[PDB]
Design a protein around this ligand. Structure first.
Ligand SMILES: Cc1cc2c(cc1C)N(S(=O)(=O)O)[C@@H]1C(=O)NC(=O)N=C1N2C[C@H](O)[C@H](O)[C@H](O)COP(=O)(O)OP(=O)(O)OC[C@H]1O[C@@H](n2cnc3c(N)ncnc32)[C@H](O)[C@@H]1O
Ligand SMILES: Cc1cc2c(cc1C)N(S(=O)(=O)O)[C@@H]1C(=O)NC(=O)N=C1N2C[C@H](O)[C@H](O)[C@H](O)COP(=O)(O)OP(=O)(O)OC[C@H]1O[C@@H](n2cnc3c(N)ncnc32)[C@H](O)[C@@H]1O
Ligand SMILES: Nc1ncnc2c1ncn2C1O[C@H](COP(=O)(O)O)[C@@H](O)[C@H]1O
Ligand SMILES: Nc1ncnc2c1ncn2[C@H]1O[C@H](COP(=O)(O)O)[C@@H](O)[C@H]1O
Ligand SMILES: Nc1ncnc2c1ncn2[C@H]1O[C@H](COP(=O)(O)O)[C@@H](O)[C@H]1O
Ligand code: SF4
Ligand code: SF4
Ligand code: SF4
Ligand code: SF4
Ligand code: NA
Lengths: 642, 149, 642, 149
């Protein structure tokens, strides 16, 4: 709910337009975007190219890493700088198995061979990495390393600012739609946005555009609906902006049915990675049973995935769901037993690990430490409840939803290159349009280091694309004016119909952003495998979801906004609605249940490797308002075995 | 969600910018031109990231846990410096914990993005190598990965 | 969420006290309360007794019947005025079996032998009852008759007003606590309240007090959490006030674990009674399966309950819960097939029943007709989705939660008289304190007619009690002053701590009513068998609920209010919190699952007629802050066999 | 929830009392002394009972379905009389339905609570009989119910 203190209204025609001409436009200054800005600045010199970074908030703290992070989840370690060395083949195997068999191995292997360099740079720039007395990076699990990352974003932000220059970073500018080449229907030409600090419309003309807006949250109703509606596990700042603008432009999506359901400390959603992997904490149900033991047999039906090590995350969730359906909650993270075991009676050792335990929260999700404080929970004395949160759509974490992107020439097989007009690393099916971080699908487990790295990869590819293809996109001024009118339409609608009611938020001719968002969340929660149905859905529910989303989409044409802040909220809602539609259509198309634990198709309860071991890719044609789906069979690119 | 203490907030005296309004990743902090004091304009959209809290030069911002699940009384107070950050965690029951963690090993604003890197070349633009590679990776050569036979 | 336009603050010491002396005080001017006012006015003349009715809103439309009702759910018909005559023994059997074997038959038979007279008066007063060409009341099912009841409450309000007199009706006065006899810890002496229209504190001194506040809603998170948080099936106006004040006074509660889960049209919560019983509508899952038939086997384990006709309400719910757990939604009410089959090809007949279908909603829950209009659902063409709503605590409908009350001398067995110091009909265990309608437990299926009737019964008993016992309790002025301070404490707290934050609703030293309610709803939803867990719970969850409710109760001492409206909201919350605590403690005490479909204890999944065929009665001792429970074995009072 | 049309609301300033404020069962309708026009002070606590809508003499109040599940465009408008009520249901798609139902068979304010009843007596006070019984029940004798042997 939003109640503006005062109005801040503008009519499209009263708003000045600022035109910015650049070569490479990066939309989103989070981890992937900063990686793109950093790397782009390096290669751009070859052609004296201009690199521009646009961010809706402030790069110093914007995005998922605003609070910092307690670990870097992706560090292969090919030399032995950490407590544990790994191979690239083992990593690729790990990711494909976690995806229950479906991952673009060319893309995964590609960021994996580059990620360590990124991490080494982060340390060079000042990021304090946990080290053993011997000087080795402290491992959390097999693939992660612990860090003192409270200032993780500010440090990366500084690197990007130093690289591209502050004069090339536009902050507090919300991008809401892409612009296409009125010379070519399948080529990008820039994007449009508006400031959230003043009345100013932005028209960015560019030769290459890189989507780095992060994923999508708040599509589904959360487990807390009051103030805590704001306590989403994933970044509440990411609202599927890249997904919306890219799909509207005709860029194909992939694995959009693959959402991620995080199992975390209840309500506050504090991290469990360190507790499980580093502190060796056990999770037990209300009766003291360690369900990863009691539910192990139930994974036998998922051979060879169920017999993989580590066990696929969705299958871990599945074991949790079985416990929930049997009514064995609360589920507890026994931090008290973990700390006692690790300290071994050594009081000084206990004090040290106790500080580490709190840092794990204070460096990344303070709300969990605050929750403990408010509820008088001392981790050394009593356990904490844990639970799965509502679904989130992203491609950098454990979820792989995003755009179908091209891989490197040396790893991408012919099977995966067919839909790309131009073969440039991380480019979408739309020429000149790239996708990174959460926006790039089918290659998950990138996390902070991998997302920055993918941005680096796309940035070099963008410079290469520009110097090799030499594009010269022309924006359609007619479309731009149409978009400008659309941009401020909500404000004009508010002024035009507010007099129909004595209450600004109860009007028959319009809906405010928070009102449309509550509606979206209810629809997705109840029909798209949200918490309401313990992540279950079927053909009928999904079809009803499309009907309700259709009504909502039509009502978006009657959105109203009272100030710039709410105008941004209005467009963030629009972005989420289309992302939601894509998600529903993808879940409806795949007739199987490959990731039980993330979602269940009760009408197609089994995993089908005979007919569905393929990536589901889709394209939205705005002109015809039609969605087309295609199945791209998975092929093993890297050598490995279960 | 975050909230501003009127007694400590000075609407950011004569500085060039309003710290809280400038830093908030979700555009929640704003100034009430009348009172000349800041406030969270939409608390149910607050992620409780503590960015505003850490950047307020007057320490006029605190966080009150979401009412949905938070009993009254708890608080986490940061005092962020240049190389480390201190935290004080106060429990509803009076318990007080104090921690201090490193946050950076180098001076702020000291990053040289391409320090020691060779200049880019048109030839290098066509390879798979990123800036600083393969040197920054630490390996004896660009990492190779076995393709499926 | 509440955002007052401006402040309306008062300190206790500056608010004038108005003392009202009366003989019989009726708290709540709804159906049961109006029945008490009506009947009390008749008998009061015998002793020149004064009768006072206090209502927080306006009697003309206050309570559950604000929109009107489409039927009178309880009409026995002992002479043939309707399409179907019935016997009292058959009715008592029907209620006991629907309650899965547990009902105070002395109380049920008692209101049943009186209810028809009430219905006849309703018609005489102007209520239009549907009639056949032959002049018989049109039956819905076996026990209900259809009515054109849009003005049902206004008509009953007029009758009560004519009886007691307008000068004896206090409106817009919220009663928040009872007063007890200074010289007898188990006798009532009056009550205290405050106006919500002006600064005025009320002190009612009475010899007999009748609790008629309706049940409790909004204790649990609803299926819609935004604006629709206000769309509860049951009266959102009833917040468990009677339960709170009576339990605080030490009056014993009974069957408080027996909540009611209504199966209704989805989201709007329109009625299904007429559709099932009158229109012969079928309910089917997403695959056209009539689950009342496909899930018939699952009821065989319940003996003899599963073979009863009609099937007990909770078991009907159980069948649809099984469908929901299997993921077979949407569940549909096939109104289209019902109308087609009833009309039989006769277009004129179709038009008639079509109008009847819409009246069913427009006379009782307009929101459902509005939902149909907004979603373009024409009941003659497409079906409507249905679903069980969240739990409600009340004793007038299909739930029997309420106070343990005394029965009539000629029907109540000695087994049920043990806990009553004085044996007056409908008197609680606290002398001089009566409970009716939703407030009287263990005698459900009263509905509109039955609640008005129970009020009449208690009213006559109250006059008899006063004339026979000549009660003369004395209020404790010291307690009154302490209660006056507490009454306005929220306003004083707001004024005292508002300066700690620049935002009125984000303060570290207080919670506003809507904030405490969101918290209560989340606790109950997640741990007390709410919608979140498909109505399942266990000992561990219930124990955690008590821990969280303890934190909330403590925080109630830090409630704040910005105006009189919110001050009422503050006390409505206090009332709900204690009601919720009582509900949780009762569910924790009963170690069985007697009403699957209403709630399931996963740790005690079976119905236990060997050790739990008893009423669960509790008492809260405010001075010791202790709860005590006891089992009162059910005994069959009326002659009937399965 | 309910909302007031500014063009039709006159704040009941030509009446002895404010109709909507008086009737609302949840105390939501109140007057904005500034505009002298009513408004719903807490819409998320509105039960959509339509009491305010029916009692507004200016027909200035309507209901806009809860945003959580209501697409825009639908409406139910009543015109309540003395013996019947008329309803117009307008669908989002433009369809319009009209209904008319009876609401009362006697004049308003005509109820004589104890019409035909004998006076109460001390003897009667000790029986199980309520006012008007046993005859109002339709039987010459008080209904009997068989107690289990
Ligand atoms: C939210 C969150 C995330 C993680 C974790 C805990 C929590 C609580 N923990 S663990 O415990 O889970 O394990 C991690 C951990 O410890 N270690 C690790 O490496 N990664 C973790 N992640 C994952 C990483 O943080 C993640 O992979 C990367 O940040 C993804 O990067 P990117 O895809 O670039 O998203 P971003 O959020 O950083 O940035 C997006 C930017 O776009 C902006 N933006 C969005 N829409 C826009 C628009 N329309 N116009 C202009 N700008 C517009 C955003 O404002 C932001 O700046
Ligand atoms: C909400 C609802 C209820 C029903 C139904 C549909 C819907 C949508 N439909 S069907 O679907 O089931 O079918 C019914 C139907 O068709 N036929 C029928 O006979 N009964 C139905 N009910 C049931 C009856 O309405 C119910 O049994 C009776 O109204 C219960 O009477 P009572 O127990 O007296 O509750 P009330 O709500 O009428 O009145 C309570 C009063 O107390 C006031 N109050 C509350 N606390 C207060 C405070 N602290 N101090 C001062 N006054 C304070 C209230 O303002 C109200 O005036
Ligand atoms: N399927 C059913 N069989 C028998 N009685 C029902 C059924 N559905 C509802 N009733 C009921 O009829 C009345 C109106 O139902 P409802 O509106 O659902 O509250 C109540 O008296 C219930 O006992
Ligand atoms: N039980 C586990 N086994 C292997 N990896 C895990 C486990 N739990 C979490 N991880 C993960 O460790 C990281 C941080 O965990 P989380 O906070 O759960 O996101 C991610 O890289 C996950 O792959
Ligand atoms: N989401 C999850 N829910 C419950 N347990 C998990 C989850 N993710 C991982 N685990 C497991 O993490 C650890 C992996 O155990 P193991 O394979 O024995 O090394 C155990 O501590 C489990 O609790
Ligand atoms: S940064 Fe602090 S001092 Fe400055 S306006 Fe914000 S709260 Fe006030
Ligand atoms: S805690 Fe974070 S999200 Fe909340 S107001 Fe402050 S900076 Fe913004
Ligand atoms: S009853 Fe109607 S005219 Fe009167 S104040 Fe209310 S809305 Fe305005
Ligand atoms: S519709 Fe009913 S609950 Fe809503 S404001 Fe009007 S009278 Fe009040
Ligand atoms: Na029935």
């Amino acid at each position: 709910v939003y109640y503006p203190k005062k109005y801040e209204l503008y009519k499209a025609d009263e708003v000045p337009t600022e035109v910015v001409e650049t070569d490479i436009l990066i939309i989103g200054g989070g981890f992937s975007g900063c990686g793109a800005a950093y790397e782009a600045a390096y290669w751009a010199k070859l052609g004296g190219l201009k690199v521009t970074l646009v961010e809706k908030a402030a790069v110093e703290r914007s995005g998922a890493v605003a609070q910092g992070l307690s670990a870097i989840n992706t560090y292969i370690d090919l030399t032995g700088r950490s407590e544990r060395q790994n191979t690239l083949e083992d990593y690729v195997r790990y990711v494909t198995l976690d995806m229950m068999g479906l991952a673009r191995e060319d893309l995964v292997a590609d960021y994996a061979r580059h990620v360590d360099g990124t991490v080494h740079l982060f340390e060079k720039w000042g990021l304090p990495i946990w080290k053993t007395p011997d000087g080795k990076y402290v491992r959390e699990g097999q693939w992660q390393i612990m860090i003192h990352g409270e200032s993780y974003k500010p440090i990366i932000a500084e690197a990007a600012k130093m690289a591209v220059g502050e004069e090339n970073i536009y902050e507090r500018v919300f991008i809401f739609e892409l612009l296409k080449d009125k010379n070519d229907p399948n080529a990008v030409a820039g994007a449009v946005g508006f400031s959230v600090r003043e009345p100013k419309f932005y028209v960015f003309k560019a030769k290459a555009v890189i989507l780095a807006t992060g994923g999508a949250t708040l599509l589904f109703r959360p487990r807390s609906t009051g103030e805590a509606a704001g306590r989403t596990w994933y970044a509440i700042f990411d609202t599927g902006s890249g997904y919306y603008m890219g799909l509207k432009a005709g860029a194909m999506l992939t694995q959009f049915e693959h959402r991620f359901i995080p199992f975390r400390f209840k309500d506050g959603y504090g991290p469990v990675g360190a507790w499980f992997l580093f502190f060796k904490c056990k999770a037990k149900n209300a009766y003291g049973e360690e369900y990863i033991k009691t539910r192990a047999a139930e994974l036998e039906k998922y051979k060879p995935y169920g017999a993989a090590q580590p066990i696929p995350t969705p299958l871990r969730n599945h074991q949790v769901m079985l416990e929930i359906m049997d009514g064995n909650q609360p589920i507890y993270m026994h931090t008290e037993e973990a700390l006692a075991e690790l300290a071994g009676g050594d009081k000084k050792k206990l004090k040290h690990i106790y500080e580490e335990a709190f840092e794990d929260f204070l460096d990344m999700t303070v709300s969990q430490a605050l929750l403990w404080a408010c509820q008088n929970i001392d981790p050394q004395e009593q356990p904490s409840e844990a639970a799965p949160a509502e679904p989130y759509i992203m491609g950098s974490h454990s979820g792989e939803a995003g755009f179908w992107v091209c891989g490197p020439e040396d790893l991408m097989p012919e099977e995966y290159a067919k839909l790309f007009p131009l073969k440039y690393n991380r480019m979408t099916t739309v020429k000149g349009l790239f996708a990174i971080g959460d926006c790039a699908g089918a290659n998950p487990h990138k996390f902070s280091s991998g997302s920055f790295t993918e941005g680096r990869i796309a940035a070099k590819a963008a410079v290469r694309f520009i110097l090799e293809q030499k594009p010269n996109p022309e924006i359609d001024d007619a479309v731009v004016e149409e978009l400008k009118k659309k941009a401020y339409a909500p404000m004009e609608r508010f002024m035009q119909y507010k007099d129909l009611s004595t209450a600004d938020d109860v009007n028959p001719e319009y809906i405010l952003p928070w009102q449309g968002l509550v509606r979206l969340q209810k629809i997705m929660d109840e029909y798209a495998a949200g918490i309401a149905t313990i992540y279950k859905t079927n053909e009928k529910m999904l079809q009803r979801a499309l009907e309700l989303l259709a009504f909502l989409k039509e009502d978006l044409e009657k959105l109203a906004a009272r100030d710039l802040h709410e105008l941004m909220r209005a467009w963030e809602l629009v972005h989420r609605v289309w992302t939601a539609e894509a998600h529903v259509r993808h879940m409806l198309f795949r007739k199987e249940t490959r990731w039980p634990g993330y979602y269940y198709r009760t009408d197609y309860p089994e995993l089908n490797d005979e007919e569905w071991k393929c990536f589901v890719c889709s394209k939205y044609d705005a002109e015809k308002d039609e969605w087309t789906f295609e199945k791209v069979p998975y092929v093993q690119v890297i050598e490995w075995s279960f | 969600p975050s909230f501003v203490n009127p007694e400590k907030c000075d609407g950011c005296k004569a500085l060039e910018r309003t710290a809280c309004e400038y830093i908030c990743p979700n555009d929640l902090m704003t100034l009430d031109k009348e009172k000349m004091k800041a406030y969270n304009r939409e608390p149910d959209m607050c992620w409780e990231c503590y960015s505003c809290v850490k950047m307020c030069p007057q320490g006029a911002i605190d966080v009150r846990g979401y009412v949905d699940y938070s009993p009254l009384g708890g608080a986490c107070v940061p005092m962020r410096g240049t190389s480390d950050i201190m935290w004080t965690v106060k429990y509803r029951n009076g318990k007080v914990l104090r921690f201090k963690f490193a946050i950076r090993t180098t001076p702020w604003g000291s990053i040289q993005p391409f320090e020691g890197f060779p200049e880019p070349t048109e030839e290098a633009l066509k390879s798979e190598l990123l800036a600083g590679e393969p040197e920054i990776i630490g390996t004896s050569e660009f990492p190779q990965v076995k393709k499926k036979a």
